[PDB]
Structures are given as C-alpha cells and as structure tokens.
C-alpha cells in the first residue's frame, strides 16, 4: 500500500493523520516535533488522538526516535503488524 | 502486511534485512547504530546492500533520524510507496 510521512503543524493535519490510518489503512510515520515545540495544546491533542486510535480502532503506535528536532512515531493500522526482531 | 524493525549486529542480520525486503516484500525500519559504532566495515557493507536493493530491486530507502544512539532508515519494497505530505 502506502506509508505516509507527515510532520503535522495544525489540528487539521492531525485529523488527516487519523483519516490515513483509519479510513485508508495506511501506516503513518508521524513527526510530532513541530507540535511539541510550538503548541503544547495541539501536541497534547495529537497524543489523545493516538490514544483513541489504539484503544478504539486496534491501531499500534510505536515510538521510533525522539532526538535532535524530531519526535518520530509509527502508527500502524489494524492489518499491518509491526514485528520486531 | 508486516513492517519489520531490526537493529542488525552481524552480516547475517543484514542479509536477513535484505531477504525481508526482497523475498517477503516487507518494509524494514532499520537501525544501523550498532554497526556504525562497533563495525565500520559491516556498516559499510550494509550501505552497499541498501544501494543494491535500490538500484536492482526498485526498493526505496529513506533516512528517518540519525540522533542519540539511533540511525534509523526505512527501506520500502517495490509495491509499498513512501508518500510524504
């Protein structure tokens, strides 16, 4: 399919991430660093939406790296399993 | 399908990464930090195998984050497109 890479800057960008995972069943490599730096409130909202996707839609969300101006998480929809070796 | 997460420590682990992308058509989120620190030669070999997968098998390989003890690259097989918004 497609794996989407997104660095959201607005609440609408967050809702686009949600739609990609839930409606399109595309994994998203999400960079939360802009929200974390510039809008604590929208950073918190993004975390709440990730919580909702995990709890209510069966998505996985795995921290990859939070370092040097990036805060990278992979969100995988139900049907694309993360497998760590 | 499956997205594999692997931090190789040996040449055999590298060849397993290759097999996942080429034979199983699974994307791999690859952490090269152990090779980079502990074996420059095997780090270089991993780079050569990534080059071969891109050039000869149509794979994509996109740097995600090299920071604070991680060197993360996503390798996507032909048929799983990376899409950046």
Residue numbers in the entry:
A (entry chain A), B (entry chain A): 65 to 149
Give the exact sentences the study uses for this entry.
Here, we combine structural, cellular, and evolutionary analyses to demonstrate that SepF is the FtsZ anchor in the human-associated archaeon Methanobrevibacter smithii. M. smithii SepF binds to membranes and to FtsZ, inducing filament bundling. High-resolution crystal structures of archaeal SepF alone and in complex with the FtsZ C-terminal domain (FtsZCTD) reveal that SepF forms a dimer with a homodimerization interface driving a binding mode that is different from that previously reported in bacteria.
We determined the crystal structure of MsSepFcore, at 1.4 Å resolution. The protein is a dimer in solution, with each protomer consisting of a 5-stranded β-sheet flanked by 2 α-helices. In addition, a helical turn insertion (η1), between strand β2 and helix α2, is conserved in archaeal sequences but is absent in bacterial homologs. Despite their quite similar monomeric structure, the dimeric arrangement of archaeal SepF differs from that observed for the functional dimer in CgSepF, where the dimer interface is formed by a 4 α-helical bundle. Interestingly, the functional dimer (as defined by its complex with FtsZ) strikingly differs between MsSepF, where it is formed via a β-β interface, and CgSepF, where it is formed via an α-α interface. Importantly, a bacterial-like α-α interface is not possible in archaeal SepF because a crucial glycine residue (Gly114 in CgSepF) buried at the center of the bacterial interface is substituted by charged residues with longer side chains (Lys, Glu, Asp) in archaeal sequences, precluding such interaction to occur. However, the only other available bacterial SepF structure (CgSepF) revealed that a C-terminal helix α3 interacts with the β-sheet of SepF and would therefore preclude formation of a β-β interface. Remarkably, helix α3 is predicted to be conserved in most bacterial sequences including B. subtilis, but not in Archaea. In fact, we (and others) did not obtain conclusive experimental evidence that MsSepF polymerizes, and the three available archaeal SepF structures provide no hints about a possible mechanism.
